[PDB]
Amino acid sequence: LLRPGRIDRKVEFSLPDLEGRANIFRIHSKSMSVERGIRWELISRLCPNSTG
C-alpha cells in the first residue's frame, strides 16, 4: 500500500506550538461561562505540549 500511485500525499500531523494550542483552548473555553478578562495564553503556557 505504501508504494506510489496509491498514495499521492503523505502528511505528518503533530501536536501544535503554543499559539495554536492557545487557539484550541480558546474555542472550548468560550462555550462555557467564565469570568471574562481571561488570559488563554497564560493557561497554555503552563501546560507542556499536549493533545486537543
Partner: protein, 242 residues
C-alpha cells in the same frame, strides 16, 4: 555517549538544543532598554509565606555600572556570575577603565565555552558550555545604554527589548508593538509591570516583583520597596476605568 564532540544530524550541538528547554523553565525576566535608563524587572519565585523574599536575588550586581539578570539552571548560573565578576575587576586593573558592556558580553561567552572532552589548545575542567542565558546590561559612552542577550549558542545579540523564561513568547509579542524610541524611564517602568501581571500565575505585588536600573548617574542601583509599590498603585487606577 552523546558528547559535546558529537553533533546532531543537522550539525547542531546537543547541549544547545537541550539548554533551550532548561531556560524555558527558568524565571521570567523582562528587559526594556532605553537611552534614559535600562529597566530590568524580574519575577521572584515564591513557594511559601515562610520564604523570606528579602534574601533571595535574581538581579545580581556584576560591577559598579553593570547589572544582570539570570535564568536557567540557577546553581550553574551562580558560578557564571562569580567568574563574570572576576573578568571585570581584571580589566579594571589593566586599563584603569570601566569595561564596555559589549566586550564584557564576549569575555563571558569565551568562558562558558570549554568542555571536558579533552582539547589540545585549551584547558578542560567543565563538560559543556553553560546551558543558561543571561541578560547583560550596562552603560558606557560609546554605545550609550545597552542590553544584551547572550545565548548558550556562543552568540550575542544586542536588543531593544528581550523576554526570557516562562513568559518569553507572549511578552515578546507585546514588546515589538509597545517598545518605541520615544520612551523614557518613567514610561518604561510602567510597561514592564503591565506585561509582568499577565504572565504572572498569581497576583502582581511589590513583594514578588523586583525592579532595578542601570543609569549612569547612580550605576547599578536596586529600587527600594516604596518606588515599586507606587508604580503598581498608579497602574491600578488606570485599569479600573475599564
Amino acid at each position: 555517549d552523546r558528547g559535546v564532540s558529537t553533533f546532531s544530524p543537522e550539525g547542531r550541538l546537543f547541549q544547545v538544543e537541550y539548554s533551550l528547554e532548561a531556560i524555558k523553565l527558568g524565571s521570567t525576566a523582562i528587559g526594556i532598554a532605553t537611552k534614559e535608563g535600562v529597566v530590568l524587572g524580574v519575577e521572584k519565585r515564591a513557594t511559601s509565606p515562610l520564604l523570606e523574599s528579602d534574601s533571595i536575588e535574581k538581579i545580581v550586581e556584576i560591577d559598579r555600572h553593570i547589572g544582570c539578570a539570570m535564568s536557567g539552571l540557577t546553581a550553574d548560573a551562580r558560578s557564571m556570575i562569580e567568574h563574570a565578576r572576576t573578568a571585570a575587576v581584571t580589566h579594571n586593573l589593566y586599563y584603569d577603565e570601566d569595561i564596555n558592556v559589549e566586550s564584557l558580553t564576549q569575555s563571558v561567552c569565551d568562558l562558558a565555552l570549554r568542555f571536558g572532552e579533552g582539547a589540545s589548545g585549551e584547558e578542560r575542567l567543565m563538560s559543556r558550555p553553560f546551558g543558561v542565558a543571561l541578560l547583560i546590561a550596562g552603560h558606557d559612552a560609546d554605545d550609550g545604554y545597552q542590553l544584551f542577550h547572550a545565548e548558550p549558542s556562543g552568540t550575542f545579540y544586542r536588543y531593544n527589548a528581550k523576554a526570557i523564561g516562562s513568559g518569553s513568547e507572549g511578552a515578546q509579542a507585546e514588546l515589538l508593538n509597545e517598545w518605541h524610541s520615544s520612551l523614557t524611564l518613567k514610561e518604561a517602568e510602567l510597561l514592564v509591570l503591565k506585561i509582568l501581571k499577565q504572565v504572572m500565575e498569581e497576583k502582581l505585588d511589590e513583594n514578588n516583583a523586583q525592579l532595578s536600573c542601570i543609569t549612569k548617574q547612580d550605576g547599578f542601583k536596586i529600587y527600594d520597596n516604596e518606588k515599586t509599590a507606587e508604580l503598581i498603585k498608579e497602574l491600578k487606577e488606570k485599569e479600573a476605568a475599564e
